[PDB]
Design a binder for this molecule. Structure first.
Ligand SMILES: N=c1ccc2c(-c3ccc(C(=O)NCc4ccn(-c5cc6c(cc5C(F)(F)F)[nH]c(=O)c(=O)n6CC(=O)O)c4)cc3C(=O)O)c3ccc(N)c(S(=O)(=O)O)c3oc-2c1S(=O)(=O)O
Length: 259
């Protein structure tokens, strides 16, 4: 039997380098939620596996000009990996070209504030202009606002699209720094999972407020028609029912949190 090639992505806390990684080999180089999850999936499915970091560092999209899938999705579609174990969002266009398990983690768009900011909901943000707010320039959150027909989110998009200086940031680190350094006058819109992670990072000055604005899930992906997909999906369901997915989330977000 052959070693399963698992594509994954360097993204904290899902996959992170061990400090001594230069003196380590194979799967021992990495730690994180998806490292632990890969070991559990492999245990339940009965395979040996090698974690490999996706070469282009991307989740996966179809290039608008060439029509070629990149990222982990592309690794699956073009025969370079057997399974993707990563926070890969289950979307329509991806589901058409690869197979997904049921989701192992659910999430939604959410609001990050500096502690003390008088905001508790998206509606609160939308009905004022003293506190600026934005999102990742390249993110799925931006696209949610662009396409939304809900009055509150439409108003928020109209504000964000034309706000000056730009309220959009190039990276999560830029967004978080802007929240922390703006003295409560900038709020940041992002995935609840990342928001919750940052809430547990020093110096513990940010928090997540309000309910999620949408709902989506991260799934395990296999090439379309792969015989591995059935067992992997049953594994995700068993791990959820055993409490193990919740245990892993608690471990990497809270037991290992700094706040
Ligand atoms: N200098 C730079 C520097 C960075 C540039 C980036 C860039 C931006 C931001 C970040 C960053 O904050 N990462 C942390 C983060 C925040 C949210 N997630 C997340 C996203 C998922 C996902 C799971 C998660 C997680 F983790 F929450 F679970 N699962 C999916 O299934 C999925 O799909 N997504 C995407 C989505 O949901 O959105 C992760 C990292 C990068 C990067 O270096 O890869 C860049 C990206 C796209 C793009 N088209 C272009 S660009 O074309 O070049 O403009 C980009 O450019 C960049 C230039 S740049 O080129 O010089 O202008």
């Amino acid at each position: 039997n052959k070693t399963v090639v698992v594509t994954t992505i360097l993204e904290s806390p899902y996959v992170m380098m061990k400090k001594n990684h230069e003196m380590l080999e194979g799967n021992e180089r990495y730690e994180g939620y998806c490292v632990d999850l890969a070991a559990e999936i492999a245990k339940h499915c009965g395979f040996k596996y090698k974690l490999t970091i996706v070469g282009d560092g991307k989740y996966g999209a179809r290039d608008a000009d060439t029509k070629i899938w990149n990222g982990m999705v592309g690794e699956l579609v073009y025969g370079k990996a057997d399974i993707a174990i990563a926070p890969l969002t289950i979307t329509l266009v991806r589901e058409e070209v690869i197979d997904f398990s049921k989701p192992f983690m659910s999430l939604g768009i959410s609001i990050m504030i500096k502690k003390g900011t008088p905001i508790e909901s998206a509606e609160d943000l939308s009905k004022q202009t003293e506190i600026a707010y934005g999102t990742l320039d390249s993110g799925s959150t931006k696209e949610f606002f662009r396409r939304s027909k809900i009055a509150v989110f439409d108003k928020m998009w109209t504000y964000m699209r034309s706000a000056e200086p730009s309220v959009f940031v190039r990276t999560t680190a830029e967004g978080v720094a802007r929240v922390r350094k703006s003295k409560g006058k900038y709020a940041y819109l992002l995935e609840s999972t990342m928001n919750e992670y940052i809430e547990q990072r020093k110096p513990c000055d940010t928090m997540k407020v309000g309910g999620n604005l949408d709902s989506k899930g991260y799934g395990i992906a296999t090439p379309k028609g792969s015989s591995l997909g059935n067992a992997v999906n049953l594994a995700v369901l068993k791990l959820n029912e055993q409490g193990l997915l919740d245990k892993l989330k608690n471990k990497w977000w809270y037991d290992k949190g700094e706040c």
